Amino acid sequence: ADVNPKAYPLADAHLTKKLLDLVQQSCNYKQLRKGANEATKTLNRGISEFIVMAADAEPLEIILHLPLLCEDKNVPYVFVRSKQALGRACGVSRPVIACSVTIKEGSQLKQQIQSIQQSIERLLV
Amino acid sequence: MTEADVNPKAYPLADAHLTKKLLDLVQQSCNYKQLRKGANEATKTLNRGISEFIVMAADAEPLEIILHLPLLCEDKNVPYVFVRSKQALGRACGVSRPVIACSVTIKEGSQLKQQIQSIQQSIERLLV
Amino acid sequence: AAPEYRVIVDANNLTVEIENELNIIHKFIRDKYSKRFPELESLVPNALDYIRTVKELGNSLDKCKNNENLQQILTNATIMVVSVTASTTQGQQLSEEELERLEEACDMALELNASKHRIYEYVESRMSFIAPNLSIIIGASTAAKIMGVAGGLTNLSKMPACNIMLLGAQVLPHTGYIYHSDIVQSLPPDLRRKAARLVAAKCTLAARVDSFHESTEGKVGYELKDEIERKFDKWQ
Amino acid sequence: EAAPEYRVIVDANNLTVEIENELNIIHKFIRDKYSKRFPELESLVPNALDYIRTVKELGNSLDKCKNNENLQQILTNATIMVVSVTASTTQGQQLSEEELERLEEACDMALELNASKHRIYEYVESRMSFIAPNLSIIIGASTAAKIMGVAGGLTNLSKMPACNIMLLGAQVLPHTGYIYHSDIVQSLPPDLRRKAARLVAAKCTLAARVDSFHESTEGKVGYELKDEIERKFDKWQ
RNA sequence: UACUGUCCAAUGAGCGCAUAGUGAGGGCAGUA
RNA sequence: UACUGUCCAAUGAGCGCAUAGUGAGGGCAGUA
């Protein structure tokens, strides 16, 4: 089923998965901040790698600010079709409507991340 | 043999009969939350001027680790007495370990007021 | 410039200043009037109702039974009480200087008071256009407060709930405008911290909803407050 | 009472830290204004005094790194080979007499400060072991002179609860004070430090008190507590 | 949680960042 | 600690005072 128009950019059923096991991986690695609040904190502080949001979160607007902080420091962001999924992915019993992957010098995830960064760019204008 | 020979610096040293009354009082004041257990913790109650009396154990080796206290109850004019066993004392404060110093904190409208009263007088009596 | 909010925030401030004044006047009029009718202080406990009365009965205590104006302010109970207790007054009359001053002070209270209301009516009538969903949860007042110190509804929407909760704290540690709001205040004091967190949290949501002028007729806001109200009724 | 010896040592102790700072800074100045020729050497030997010492010799001519006598006695020979290979593969240019003159001059400075440093530590460690012998045995000459500096002398230092003593001269890291950054604590796995501090803190409070009255002058209590502590550190890994 | 065994413990167990901060499981009942 | 039942929980569980302060039990292993 089609998502709300504001959800953009929206990731292929492929990108979706690639993202969610990045997020899982970056979870057992200390480089994950989970929750729309904590998400914003890190955007503010300039230490976010990318943002993942959950286009099924109502009211949608409850996360739509994050996109506007990605403009201050240019930072990527994507919408996966479902938050229930993104919660399992972050290592939590409950839904998660956004998350943010910390910046940490010399992280073995360093490559697997930029891999995602550059993947989202290709989605945008 | 008489173990009646303890370090002289441990002054004044409670009469056996007295020594009971303290442990007993200390045991109760532990239950009325008017008790602090510890070298360090007693020092605090002295400075904050909220200790009625100080009880120390002559067992305390080296003894100097608590001799700083008598010099402080001089300043704040607080009664202080030594009992013979750090071990006996620990058990009174309800502690499986030895306790070499405890203080009976001040607190208003507590039934142990007159008890503490007496104890205090009785200590005064030997410091004089 | 021309920041609409800044005015609202600014106006809402009078109302607390006027609120402060009214308080002073009351304490004053209660103080002076107790020379003429001491016992009144405690029959009418309400600041405003107490003034309206000393303005009404004044030096003649007898004019308080049968009184049309009074009857529209005080229960029959309280009226019949002040009426009997005022034939046993226990205090002398007032000299013109003492009365004109006190009467003049009353008139003030009321002019302030009723002007304070015309100010509130503005602050709500606006606060619900700049940030409708917010206002419904906390209070048009408290809303405009935090929005004031956040410096805009936009900068407000770019904040973590954790922070918002803290907006306006210097009493109690880390109590801010939300902790002192009406909603957070109207419950048993232990339940007020869990309650501040909650409300801060849910406002950070409404704030965000309104930074996009969505749900303008006010939807989100009501549902949100409901969820909150039940979470309360649950706690006891 | 007038000029009390402790004060003189506290202030004396302080010049050492002043000089750590001064050297730390001279270090950075030389490795920097030298990383122009042999920029790599910096990364090769990471040790201040050694570095500074070497760069005074090496100097303007960098041929003959092998078989020099002080280059030898100042350096391990296993690490004197790894230079001549990156010495031939030189990465920088020769130096003006104005840029060298100020480098040599700032080395002599470095070393002469370093001398003065040690010979102050020698003084403090000595007199400290007469002033408060047991306290010293545990934490160390200097750190002991620090807790004393601020406590205002062994008497008060003594009347202080360990909790307070632990926090002496703290403001980097919250509620960590002289004893936390002491030597005997820092030499541990970082997870072990927040505990170790309170352990040391508390034993120091005992020594401190014992020294207050001038017992265990030979240093007995001190040595004992220092052992009871080291041993608990093993049981602890 | 109970019990058992061992170690440590008032001669101090455990705590200790950031408040425009923190950031995961938690409460109640019953059973073991 | 574990199990069950139920109520909450990233749309945020729990924290929020003192730091020249705090002040009691704790860790680990075996058993249920």
PDB file of N, CA, C and O in Angstrom, chain C residues 43-83:
ATOM      1  N   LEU C  43     -15.216  35.200  56.156  1.00  0.00           N
ATOM      2  CA  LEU C  43     -16.517  34.747  55.671  1.00  0.00           C
ATOM      3  C   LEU C  43     -16.454  34.680  54.153  1.00  0.00           C
ATOM      4  O   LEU C  43     -16.990  33.763  53.518  1.00  0.00           O
ATOM      5  N   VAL C  44     -15.803  35.686  53.582  1.00  0.00           N
ATOM      6  CA  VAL C  44     -15.504  35.713  52.170  1.00  0.00           C
ATOM      7  C   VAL C  44     -13.996  35.536  52.051  1.00  0.00           C
ATOM      8  O   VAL C  44     -13.229  36.431  52.399  1.00  0.00           O
ATOM      9  N   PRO C  45     -13.559  34.362  51.584  1.00  0.00           N
ATOM     10  CA  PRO C  45     -12.130  34.056  51.539  1.00  0.00           C
ATOM     11  C   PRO C  45     -11.577  34.473  50.199  1.00  0.00           C
ATOM     12  O   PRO C  45     -10.375  34.690  50.079  1.00  0.00           O
ATOM     13  N   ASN C  46     -12.463  34.575  49.210  1.00  0.00           N
ATOM     14  CA  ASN C  46     -12.085  34.819  47.824  1.00  0.00           C
ATOM     15  C   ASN C  46     -11.687  36.275  47.552  1.00  0.00           C
ATOM     16  O   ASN C  46     -12.486  37.192  47.722  1.00  0.00           O
ATOM     17  N   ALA C  47     -10.445  36.465  47.116  1.00  0.00           N
ATOM     18  CA  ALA C  47      -9.884  37.788  46.851  1.00  0.00           C
ATOM     19  C   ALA C  47     -10.851  38.715  46.139  1.00  0.00           C
ATOM     20  O   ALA C  47     -11.147  39.804  46.617  1.00  0.00           O
ATOM     21  N   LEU C  48     -11.333  38.298  44.982  1.00  0.00           N
ATOM     22  CA  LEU C  48     -12.191  39.177  44.217  1.00  0.00           C
ATOM     23  C   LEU C  48     -13.523  39.412  44.937  1.00  0.00           C
ATOM     24  O   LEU C  48     -13.990  40.543  45.032  1.00  0.00           O
ATOM     25  N   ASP C  49     -14.134  38.354  45.454  1.00  0.00           N
ATOM     26  CA  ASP C  49     -15.457  38.480  46.051  1.00  0.00           C
ATOM     27  C   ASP C  49     -15.395  39.332  47.285  1.00  0.00           C
ATOM     28  O   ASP C  49     -16.360  39.993  47.656  1.00  0.00           O
ATOM     29  N   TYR C  50     -14.243  39.302  47.931  1.00  0.00           N
ATOM     30  CA  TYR C  50     -14.035  40.105  49.119  1.00  0.00           C
ATOM     31  C   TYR C  50     -13.972  41.593  48.780  1.00  0.00           C
ATOM     32  O   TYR C  50     -14.553  42.415  49.483  1.00  0.00           O
ATOM     33  N   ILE C  51     -13.260  41.946  47.714  1.00  0.00           N
ATOM     34  CA  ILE C  51     -13.240  43.327  47.268  1.00  0.00           C
ATOM     35  C   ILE C  51     -14.628  43.763  46.859  1.00  0.00           C
ATOM     36  O   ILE C  51     -15.180  44.660  47.477  1.00  0.00           O
ATOM     37  N   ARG C  52     -15.200  43.137  45.834  1.00  0.00           N
ATOM     38  CA  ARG C  52     -16.542  43.504  45.391  1.00  0.00           C
ATOM     39  C   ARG C  52     -17.482  43.826  46.555  1.00  0.00           C
ATOM     40  O   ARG C  52     -18.386  44.664  46.411  1.00  0.00           O
ATOM     41  N   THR C  53     -17.300  43.133  47.688  1.00  0.00           N
ATOM     42  CA  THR C  53     -18.138  43.365  48.863  1.00  0.00           C
ATOM     43  C   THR C  53     -17.761  44.661  49.571  1.00  0.00           C
ATOM     44  O   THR C  53     -18.624  45.517  49.758  1.00  0.00           O
ATOM     45  N   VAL C  54     -16.498  44.816  49.978  1.00  0.00           N
ATOM     46  CA  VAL C  54     -16.095  46.051  50.663  1.00  0.00           C
ATOM     47  C   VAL C  54     -16.395  47.273  49.822  1.00  0.00           C
ATOM     48  O   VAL C  54     -16.538  48.362  50.355  1.00  0.00           O
ATOM     49  N   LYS C  55     -16.479  47.087  48.511  1.00  0.00           N
ATOM     50  CA  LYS C  55     -16.906  48.161  47.629  1.00  0.00           C
ATOM     51  C   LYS C  55     -18.386  48.374  47.793  1.00  0.00           C
ATOM     52  O   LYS C  55     -18.866  49.493  47.689  1.00  0.00           O
ATOM     53  N   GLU C  56     -19.110  47.296  48.048  1.00  0.00           N
ATOM     54  CA  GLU C  56     -20.556  47.381  48.119  1.00  0.00           C
ATOM     55  C   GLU C  56     -21.034  47.906  49.458  1.00  0.00           C
ATOM     56  O   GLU C  56     -21.724  48.922  49.530  1.00  0.00           O
ATOM     57  N   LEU C  57     -20.688  47.215  50.531  1.00  0.00           N
ATOM     58  CA  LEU C  57     -21.281  47.602  51.793  1.00  0.00           C
ATOM     59  C   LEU C  57     -20.607  48.866  52.333  1.00  0.00           C
ATOM     60  O   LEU C  57     -21.285  49.817  52.734  1.00  0.00           O
ATOM     61  N   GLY C  58     -19.283  48.908  52.267  1.00  0.00           N
ATOM     62  CA  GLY C  58     -18.573  50.136  52.574  1.00  0.00           C
ATOM     63  C   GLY C  58     -18.691  50.481  54.038  1.00  0.00           C
ATOM     64  O   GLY C  58     -18.444  49.619  54.873  1.00  0.00           O
ATOM     65  N   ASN C  59     -19.076  51.717  54.357  1.00  0.00           N
ATOM     66  CA  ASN C  59     -19.156  52.143  55.758  1.00  0.00           C
ATOM     67  C   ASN C  59     -20.461  51.763  56.433  1.00  0.00           C
ATOM     68  O   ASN C  59     -20.498  51.485  57.630  1.00  0.00           O
ATOM     69  N   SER C  60     -21.535  51.768  55.660  1.00  0.00           N
ATOM     70  CA  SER C  60     -22.820  51.304  56.148  1.00  0.00           C
ATOM     71  C   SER C  60     -22.914  49.776  56.038  1.00  0.00           C
ATOM     72  O   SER C  60     -23.172  49.244  54.956  1.00  0.00           O
ATOM     73  N   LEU C  61     -22.717  49.067  57.148  1.00  0.00           N
ATOM     74  CA  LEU C  61     -22.801  47.602  57.111  1.00  0.00           C
ATOM     75  C   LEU C  61     -24.216  47.057  56.846  1.00  0.00           C
ATOM     76  O   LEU C  61     -24.371  45.954  56.318  1.00  0.00           O
ATOM     77  N   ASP C  62     -25.234  47.843  57.200  1.00  0.00           N
ATOM     78  CA  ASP C  62     -26.637  47.430  57.086  1.00  0.00           C
ATOM     79  C   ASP C  62     -27.125  47.235  55.647  1.00  0.00           C
ATOM     80  O   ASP C  62     -28.096  46.523  55.405  1.00  0.00           O
ATOM     81  N   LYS C  63     -26.455  47.869  54.694  1.00  0.00           N
ATOM     82  CA  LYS C  63     -26.950  47.868  53.326  1.00  0.00           C
ATOM     83  C   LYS C  63     -26.627  46.547  52.622  1.00  0.00           C
ATOM     84  O   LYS C  63     -26.745  46.433  51.402  1.00  0.00           O
ATOM     85  N   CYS C  64     -26.258  45.539  53.406  1.00  0.00           N
ATOM     86  CA  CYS C  64     -25.776  44.279  52.840  1.00  0.00           C
ATOM     87  C   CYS C  64     -26.818  43.153  52.853  1.00  0.00           C
ATOM     88  O   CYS C  64     -26.637  42.117  52.191  1.00  0.00           O
ATOM     89  N   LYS C  65     -27.889  43.347  53.623  1.00  0.00           N
ATOM     90  CA  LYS C  65     -29.064  42.483  53.534  1.00  0.00           C
ATOM     91  C   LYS C  65     -30.014  43.093  52.500  1.00  0.00           C
ATOM     92  O   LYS C  65     -30.115  44.323  52.392  1.00  0.00           O
ATOM     93  N   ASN C  66     -30.682  42.251  51.715  1.00  0.00           N
ATOM     94  CA  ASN C  66     -31.641  42.748  50.731  1.00  0.00           C
ATOM     95  C   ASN C  66     -30.915  43.230  49.492  1.00  0.00           C
ATOM     96  O   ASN C  66     -31.524  43.656  48.519  1.00  0.00           O
ATOM     97  N   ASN C  67     -29.596  43.162  49.536  1.00  0.00           N
ATOM     98  CA  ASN C  67     -28.817  43.822  48.516  1.00  0.00           C
ATOM     99  C   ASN C  67     -28.813  43.087  47.193  1.00  0.00           C
ATOM    100  O   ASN C  67     -28.291  41.983  47.077  1.00  0.00           O
ATOM    101  N   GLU C  68     -29.360  43.734  46.177  1.00  0.00           N
ATOM    102  CA  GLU C  68     -29.467  43.107  44.868  1.00  0.00           C
ATOM    103  C   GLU C  68     -28.099  42.743  44.315  1.00  0.00           C
ATOM    104  O   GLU C  68     -27.869  41.607  43.917  1.00  0.00           O
ATOM    105  N   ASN C  69     -27.198  43.713  44.267  1.00  0.00           N
ATOM    106  CA  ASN C  69     -25.870  43.460  43.727  1.00  0.00           C
ATOM    107  C   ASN C  69     -25.161  42.339  44.485  1.00  0.00           C
ATOM    108  O   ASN C  69     -24.611  41.430  43.865  1.00  0.00           O
ATOM    109  N   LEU C  70     -25.189  42.399  45.819  1.00  0.00           N
ATOM    110  CA  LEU C  70     -24.531  41.385  46.646  1.00  0.00           C
ATOM    111  C   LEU C  70     -25.039  39.989  46.318  1.00  0.00           C
ATOM    112  O   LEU C  70     -24.248  39.066  46.120  1.00  0.00           O
ATOM    113  N   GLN C  71     -26.362  39.851  46.236  1.00  0.00           N
ATOM    114  CA  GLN C  71     -26.996  38.555  45.991  1.00  0.00           C
ATOM    115  C   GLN C  71     -26.530  37.886  44.705  1.00  0.00           C
ATOM    116  O   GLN C  71     -26.657  36.679  44.567  1.00  0.00           O
ATOM    117  N   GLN C  72     -25.971  38.668  43.785  1.00  0.00           N
ATOM    118  CA  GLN C  72     -25.471  38.141  42.516  1.00  0.00           C
ATOM    119  C   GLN C  72     -24.011  37.725  42.622  1.00  0.00           C
ATOM    120  O   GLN C  72     -23.415  37.263  41.638  1.00  0.00           O
ATOM    121  N   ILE C  73     -23.440  37.899  43.815  1.00  0.00           N
ATOM    122  CA  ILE C  73     -22.031  37.584  44.068  1.00  0.00           C
ATOM    123  C   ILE C  73     -21.834  36.513  45.126  1.00  0.00           C
ATOM    124  O   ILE C  73     -20.914  35.703  45.019  1.00  0.00           O
ATOM    125  N   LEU C  74     -22.685  36.543  46.157  1.00  0.00           N
ATOM    126  CA  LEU C  74     -22.600  35.624  47.297  1.00  0.00           C
ATOM    127  C   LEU C  74     -23.851  34.748  47.516  1.00  0.00           C
ATOM    128  O   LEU C  74     -24.974  35.247  47.566  1.00  0.00           O
ATOM    129  N   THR C  75     -23.634  33.442  47.661  1.00  0.00           N
ATOM    130  CA  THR C  75     -24.655  32.506  48.150  1.00  0.00           C
ATOM    131  C   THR C  75     -25.546  33.108  49.265  1.00  0.00           C
ATOM    132  O   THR C  75     -25.114  34.004  50.001  1.00  0.00           O
ATOM    133  N   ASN C  76     -26.788  32.632  49.387  1.00  0.00           N
ATOM    134  CA  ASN C  76     -27.666  33.118  50.458  1.00  0.00           C
ATOM    135  C   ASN C  76     -27.023  32.843  51.794  1.00  0.00           C
ATOM    136  O   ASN C  76     -27.016  33.679  52.685  1.00  0.00           O
ATOM    137  N   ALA C  77     -26.488  31.641  51.918  1.00  0.00           N
ATOM    138  CA  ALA C  77     -25.749  31.255  53.098  1.00  0.00           C
ATOM    139  C   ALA C  77     -24.815  32.378  53.547  1.00  0.00           C
ATOM    140  O   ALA C  77     -24.997  32.972  54.617  1.00  0.00           O
ATOM    141  N   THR C  78     -23.818  32.665  52.713  1.00  0.00           N
ATOM    142  CA  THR C  78     -22.745  33.569  53.095  1.00  0.00           C
ATOM    143  C   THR C  78     -23.294  34.954  53.353  1.00  0.00           C
ATOM    144  O   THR C  78     -22.955  35.578  54.356  1.00  0.00           O
ATOM    145  N   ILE C  79     -24.174  35.414  52.469  1.00  0.00           N
ATOM    146  CA  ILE C  79     -24.858  36.686  52.690  1.00  0.00           C
ATOM    147  C   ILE C  79     -25.579  36.740  54.038  1.00  0.00           C
ATOM    148  O   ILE C  79     -25.391  37.691  54.790  1.00  0.00           O
ATOM    149  N   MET C  80     -26.413  35.746  54.348  1.00  0.00           N
ATOM    150  CA  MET C  80     -27.170  35.803  55.598  1.00  0.00           C
ATOM    151  C   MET C  80     -26.211  35.754  56.774  1.00  0.00           C
ATOM    152  O   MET C  80     -26.532  36.248  57.854  1.00  0.00           O
ATOM    153  N   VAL C  81     -25.027  35.181  56.543  1.00  0.00           N
ATOM    154  CA  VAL C  81     -23.990  35.099  57.573  1.00  0.00           C
ATOM    155  C   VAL C  81     -23.309  36.427  57.804  1.00  0.00           C
ATOM    156  O   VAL C  81     -23.259  36.906  58.933  1.00  0.00           O
ATOM    157  N   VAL C  82     -22.760  37.012  56.739  1.00  0.00           N
ATOM    158  CA  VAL C  82     -22.188  38.352  56.866  1.00  0.00           C
ATOM    159  C   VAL C  82     -23.241  39.330  57.441  1.00  0.00           C
ATOM    160  O   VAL C  82     -22.911  40.234  58.220  1.00  0.00           O
ATOM    161  N   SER C  83     -24.508  39.124  57.101  1.00  0.00           N
ATOM    162  CA  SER C  83     -25.529  40.029  57.599  1.00  0.00           C
ATOM    163  C   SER C  83     -25.719  39.936  59.107  1.00  0.00           C
ATOM    164  O   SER C  83     -25.779  40.960  59.787  1.00  0.00           O
TER     165      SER C  83
END
